[PDB]
Ligand binder design. Structure first.
Ligand SMILES: Nc1nc2c(ncn2[C@@H]2O[C@H](COP(=O)(O)OP(=O)(O)OP(=O)(O)O)[C@@H](O)[C@H]2O)c(=O)[nH]1
Ligand SMILES: [Mg+2]
Lengths: 415, 137, 18, 180
């Protein structure tokens, strides 16, 4: 129940404002900046502000804060969802999200803001559907918005029918300083770029553990996805009935399903790091990286970030494989490895100086995070079984998909 | 299939060597298609096994079945899920339609000795589907 | 070619489940 | 890469080296530094802070950083331990009561893992009174032979006369430079 959706800037100036109900004065935005400054300086800053009887709930963008004022007991989750949809629409329409496009795309920005939400209740949020009625370079609105299918425009024709899938894995490991992993969860991400003719009804089929158990084949390798979040095109009733994933793919790239299940296996990359930091004399980084993944998979662009001292200077890196560089901007040693074959072992021996004068305040111990990304390797073992592409006209589709394994929240707690 | 013919003798020898009663990860061949075994493909595989021998009358074992499924997946790209048998006790029919292979007693269904027996009626009659309509959807 | 694993063709449905 | 310029510079002398001047107060450290730099016995007030000078001998710039022996300046010797290659210890053989304090200070300064490549340089200062010990009694009392991985050398230098300074400089050059 947002009262006025406005876009701020880094200097407190409102780049664009669009009131939806008018129950909140437009002058309340001026007090948002002092309130945010006071909250930040006292540690009480939150995404949802409160200027007396009006709450300023907004998120932080790349360069401006999309603060949406409200007065009644409006849904905070609804406001956040509307802000996220607006950000996604802006990203789809404008390749950059900064002040350069706010002051240059006002003619289309105002129209998009007016069409997106009326009276604080959003009605249209599909970028592809919205691009057929509001353009910066007007006909009647498309029937897709009025029709039930609001995520697949009818009449789309292509020379070929090729759909590219992307099974992107997110290996997140929360390893404590004691050497044990606390939070080790893998979140799947099935992002497909559907490019077909017409409005095909894709029938996604995978080797799900529940599906295998229901069919009676609960004995082979099946992915045990604890949480499965289907897209808007995916029919919730069909999935709830008999695990049938049937939905109409959209035109372009979109996220169909987002699996998320816990992982009880050993980490793909094991980092054994030591800190022989002398008392204001020197420091040693005996960091060893052990690859527990399969030898047939190579972790391309492996970047194990080792947090070095903030005031360390004149550092020396004695590694074996991969270039090691220290970035003073990040205050850490980036153990960058181009190709990391499975089962390999890279040993590094850091050595950096330290000023004689001790630091005035503590700096903390940021966790060490690795940036391993091994393509063609599915840690969860989930494999796509079938993709039922059915069209009324009748055509031979050529679906495609690739499996990519990377590191998500794979941080290692320091000592 | 020259590759299938070559792999049939080695697969049969490995199955015979394994008695009737280390590397982590799931590597995938780049560009290799993966899909469930079809009824026609299952029928062709059953016919080839019957003609070449080594599968009809062999003692059914978990290790031998797993090795055969892995070899079939490696040589054809078929998932190792269509080589399933109906629950016992007694004669177990193939879960996938078109398969000509079935398990029959040779003497709890787990301790019962079973052997692979060719059955041409499996490719035409859905014995497994009729026995377990719920499992077939 | 493509970084992150070469794209592989997908099947149409579970042919082994009818 | 090419090292022709380095070879040309080394053909006529390129190495400079460094040195440190630490010890108890009134131990002849300032007078020794003045004699090494100028060559005269200059009377100066106690070193509240520190004195930095350089000595050019044998084509090597022997920079000397005098450090006082004051109580408030005793723990300040760690400031010069950074980017330091040499260290010279000035003993006070004329102060029997301060000999133990000087030995304790030398042991404390020698018990740091940052100062490991600095070879020991014991200078017998105030070598003009009959109460001064020899070059072995002072070393035996200080236990210089028990300093593992430490190259120490005891030399007797007279502040008023200046004898033995050349021998100490030659020993320091031989310990620092390992060429012809
Ligand atoms: N007359 C005489 N006095 C000496 C001799 N050797 C050392 N001293 C004493 O040592 C002191 C040397 O002090 P400085 O030259 O100013 O420098 P320092 O040795 O670091 O002493 P502080 O400045 O107090 O730390 C003099 O005041 C002398 O009293 C010597 O050979 N003859
Ligand atoms: Mg002095």
């Amino acid at each position: 129940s947002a009262s006025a959706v406005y876009v701020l800037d880094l200097k407190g100036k409102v780049l664009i404002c669009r009131n939806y109900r008018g129950d909140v004065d437009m002058s309340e935005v001026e007090h948002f900046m002092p309130i945010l400054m006071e909250k930040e300086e006292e540690g009480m800053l939150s995404p949802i502000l409160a200027h007396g009887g009006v709450r300023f709930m907004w998120i932080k963008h790349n360069n401006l804060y999309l603060v949406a004022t409200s007065k009644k007991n409006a849904c905070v989750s609804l406001v956040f969802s509307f802000l996220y949809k607006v950000v996604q629409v802006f990203s789809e329409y404008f390749k950059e999200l900064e002040e350069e496009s706010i002051r240059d795309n006002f003619v289309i920005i105002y129209e998009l803001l007016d069409e997106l939400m009326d009276f604080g209740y959003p009605q249209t949020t599909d970028s592809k559907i919205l691009q057929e009625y509001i353009t910066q370079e007007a006909p009647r609105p498309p029937a897709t918005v009025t029709n039930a299918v609001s995520w697949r425009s009818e009449g789309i024709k292509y020379r070929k029918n090729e759909v590219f899938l992307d099974v992107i894995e997110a290996v997140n490991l929360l390893v404590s300083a004691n050497g044990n992993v606390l939070r080790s969860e893998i979140v799947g991400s099935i992002k497909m770029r559907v490019f077909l003719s017409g409005m095909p009804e894709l029938r996604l089929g995978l080797n799900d553990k529940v599906l295998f158990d229901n069919t009676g084949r609960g004995k082979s390798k099946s992915v045990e996805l604890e949480d499965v979040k289907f897209h808007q095109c995916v029919r919730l009733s069909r999935f709830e009935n008999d695990r049938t994933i049937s939905f109409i793919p959209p035109d372009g790239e979109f996220e169909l399903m987002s699996y998320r299940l816990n992982t009880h296996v050993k980490p793909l990359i094991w980092i054994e790091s030591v800190i022989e930091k002398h008392s204001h004399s020197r420091i040693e980084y005996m960091v060893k990286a052990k690859s527990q993944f399969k030898r047939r998979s190579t972790a391309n662009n492996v970047e194990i970030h080792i947090p070095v001292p903030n005031d360390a200077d004149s550092p020396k890196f004695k590694t074996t494989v991969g270039s090691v560089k220290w970035v003073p901007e990040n205050s850490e040693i980036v153990w960058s490895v181009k190709s990391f074959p499975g089962g390999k072992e890279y040993l590094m021996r850091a050595h950096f100086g330290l000023p004689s004068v001790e630091a005035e305040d503590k700096e903390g111990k940021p966790p060490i995070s690795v940036k391993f990304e091994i393509p063609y390797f599915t840690t969860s073992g989930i494999q796509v079984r079938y993709l039922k592409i059915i069209e009324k006209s009748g055509y031979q589709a050529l679906p495609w998909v690739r499996y990519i394994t990377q590191n998500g929240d794979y941080q290692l707690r320091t000592q | 299939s020259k590759s299938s013919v070559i792999g049939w003798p080695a697969v049969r020898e490995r199955m015979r060597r394994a008695e009737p009663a280390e590397e982590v990860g799931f590597p995938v061949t780049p560009q290799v298609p993966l899909r469930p075994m079809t009824y026609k493909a299952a029928v062709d595989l059953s016919h080839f096994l019957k003609e070449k021998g080594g599968l009809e009358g062999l003692i059914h074992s978990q290790r031998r079945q797993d090795i055969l499924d892995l070899w079939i997946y490696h040589t054809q790209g078929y998932f190792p899920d269509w080589q399933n048998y109906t629950p016992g006790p007694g004669v177990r029919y193939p879960l996938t339609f078109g398969w000509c292979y079935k398990l029959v007693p040779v003497e709890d269904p787990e301790r019962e000795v079973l052997e692979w027996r060719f059955d041409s009626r499996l490719a035409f009659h859905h014995v497994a589907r009729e026995l377990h309509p719920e499992y077939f959807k | 070619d493509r970084k992150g694993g070469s794209y592989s063709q997908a099947a149409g449905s579970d042919s082994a489940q009818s | 890469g090419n090292i022709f310029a380095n070879l040309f510079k080394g053909l006529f002398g390129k190495k400079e080296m460094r040195i440190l001047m630490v010890g108890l107060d009134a131990a002849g450290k300032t007078t020794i530094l003045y004699k090494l730099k100028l060559g005269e016995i200059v009377t100066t007030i106690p070193t509240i802070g520190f004195n930095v000078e350089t000595v050019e001998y044998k084509n090597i710039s022997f920079t000397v950083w005098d450090v006082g022996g004051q109580d408030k300046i005793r723990p300040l010797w760690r400031h010069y331990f950074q980017n330091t290659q040499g260290l010279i210890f000035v003993v006070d053989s004329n102060d029997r009561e301060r000999v133990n304090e000087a030995r304790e200070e030398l042991m404390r300064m020698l018990a740091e893992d940052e100062l490991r490549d600095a070879v020991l340089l014991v200078f017998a200062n105030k070598q003009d009174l009959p109460n001064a010990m020899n070059a072995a009694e002072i070393t035996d009392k200080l236990g210089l032979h028990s300093l593992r991985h430490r190259n120490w050398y005891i030399q007797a230098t007279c502040a008023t006369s200046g004898d033995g300074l050349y021998e100490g400089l030659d020993w320091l050059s031989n310990q620092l430079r390992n060429q012809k």
